[PDB]
Subunit: 125 residues, 3 copies
């Protein structure tokens, strides 16, 4: 029910120019639907299912590098390696990286960040 | 130098509370947290504040997830040394509140994580 | 090799800025951060980008919290080794910007945290 493990965080753009969504709820459904498909497909391959909590956001960077004024519409995906389901943390990590790259490809993103953070998970069921 | 932060993820249980918007879910969960944190504070003098964020959680539809994700909330907070004198008792308190939130939101499962953090508090 | 991420939590000060939606607050804080980060970059060549999320912060009404929570914003960012040559200088830049944000948002207190993180950057 408790133990040291890893969480991940990925930040992606929503690519309005390609998908033409017009609200943050539409953007969340877009990214969430892609994550759902790729996570299920990898689960069928490796028996490792990576669930993700997805949050709306704006990412602020220099307008001279392409950022809209007041920020780019983005989505933050996070998840934790639950030892109830993950027997091998290194395989899970490699799965997350694989999914992050697939998300970057299918979202047509030029760059993407994927972070791993040490966490102590308490799981109540 | 280092302290802890927590992160809890819960469903919002629209079917039970009959809320109709993510804004209503935030007020619902906020009010529940506000009440349970106050109640615990009056027992132990340990107040656990929480930053609450809207979210969706994506998992396998075979396990009950709606297409594109379940509506969820993320609650986070930090053990501020200004207010916290015993980190172990603070962790116990977060866990106690996380279990109360799980019960009141009628959740079958719930995650509560602790992450090491370096807090700079400006006042 | 780990790097750092930061997390800042701030009020949105609806009463001072006369905003009436979370979207308006997000754009306002986003513009304020964009300006202070650009000005700092023009001096030090350290650009601190930030991912900003809407939120509500729940604390004791006895200390001034509104019922169900205060409207807040969470700003996070990562020290990407592709652009950050000196982590200490980056950390001091984040702290400097957090203090500027506190002043410009007219906040009485503000938290700024640093968390160790393993960053994979795909380009
Ligand atoms: N900090 C920096 N210092 C110096 N130059 C920079 C910096 N950032 C960007 N640049 C320039 O811009 C070019 C593109 O860089 P990049 O796409 O990485 O620049 C990114 C970061 O500045 C920021 N960002 C991304 N993930 C973040 C996270 N987890 N936390 C905080 N901020 C985040 O967001 C920027 C744009 C991304 N959101 C991607 C935008 C778009 N969807 C795309 O795919 O191209 C670089 O090659 C540089 O020339
Ligand atoms: N990763 C997995 N691998 C294998 N089987 C799984 C997995 N996840 C769920 N299952 C199956 O589904 C059953 C239910 O498991 P569980 O309720 O824990 O499955 C949860 C996780 O997959 C995901 N989730 C929850 N917290 C998360 C976090 N912090 N980060 C990332 N994802 C998070 O969300 C799922 C459902 C929860 N949101 C709760 C749903 C609902 N409100 C409820 O109370 O039952 C399990 O007994 C398994 O049979
Ligand atoms: N935990 C506590 N225990 C005991 N006394 C407390 C506590 N918190 C606040 N107080 C009392 O209230 C006064 C003000 O304290 P403070 O402004 O720090 O109290 C803050 C925290 O309780 C909470 N908060 C802020 N950042 C947070 C984070 N990252 N995670 C979780 N919660 C967060 O939010 C409270 C108010 C802030 N959002 C600022 C509100 C307002 N915008 C302002 O600028 O004054 C203190 O001097 C004490 O008298």
């Amino acid at each position: 029910s408790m133990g040291k493990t890893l969480r991940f965080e990925i930040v992606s753009g929503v690519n309005k120019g390609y998908f033409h969504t017009n609200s943050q709820s539409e953007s969340l459904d877009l990214v969430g639907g892609i994550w759902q498909k790729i996570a299920k497909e990898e689960f069928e391959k490796s028996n490792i299912y990576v669930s993700a909590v997805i949050k709306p956001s704006k990412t602020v960077y220099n307008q001279e590098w392409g950022c809209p004024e007041n920020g780019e519409e983005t989505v933050v995906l996070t998840g934790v390696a639950n030892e109830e389901f993950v027997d091998d943390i290194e395989k899970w990590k490699d799965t997350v990286i694989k999914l992050a790259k697939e998300l970057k490809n299918q979202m047509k993103q030029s760059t993407l960040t994927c972070e791993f953070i040490e966490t102590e998970l308490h799981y109540f069921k």
